Ligand binder design. Structure first.
Ligand SMILES: CC1=C(/C=C/C(C)=C/C=C/C(C)=C/C=O)C(C)(C)CCC1
Length: 133
């Protein structure tokens, strides 16, 4: 399905360390994060997405329309300008973040009552899994 709506609660988080190190996040921000549950809320209506991810540490909030290129300041993360574009490849939601870092983006998809998210930067991949709540 392409319907990614709802409230999603994290059940695993693989190599978030490596992904953050690839983005040049200070050792201490990485220490704080590294581990910590999370809730992602996706409100999607056709191509229009409003997403909230929440942790006890920092929020990162992302709204976009699929197929409409937009400039992203990645505020919560690594302090950067990117040209972000979100598109569909089959039922996989794909974001390419163009700028200094190579191979920067993410891919998100649904299989069952789970949401899967693969965050990439350079040679690094972080894999998250969420359950619908
Ligand atoms: C690095 C980092 C974070 C992660 C940010 C990410 C990976 C956001 C991805 C959002 C997506 C892919 C939304 C798509 O719908 C947090 C949690 C703010 C904690 C502080 C450090």
């Amino acid at each position: 399905t392409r319907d990614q709506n709802g409230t999603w609660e994290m059940e695993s988080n693989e190599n978030f360390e490596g992904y953050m190190k690839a983005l040049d996040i200070d050792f201490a921000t990485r220490k704080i994060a590294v581990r910590l549950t999370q809730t992602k809320v996706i409100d999607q209506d056709g191509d229009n997405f409003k997403t909230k991810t929440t942790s006890t540490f920092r929020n990162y909030d992302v709204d976009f329309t699929v197929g409409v290129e937009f400039d992203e300041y990645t505020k919560s993360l690594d302090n950067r300008h990117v040209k972000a574009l979100v598109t569909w490849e089959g039922d996989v939601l794909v974001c390419v973040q163009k700028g200094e870092k190579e191979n920067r983006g993410w891919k998100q998809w649904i299989e069952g009552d789970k949401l899967y998210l693969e965050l990439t930067c350079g040679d690094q991949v972080c894999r998250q899994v969420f359950k619908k709540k």
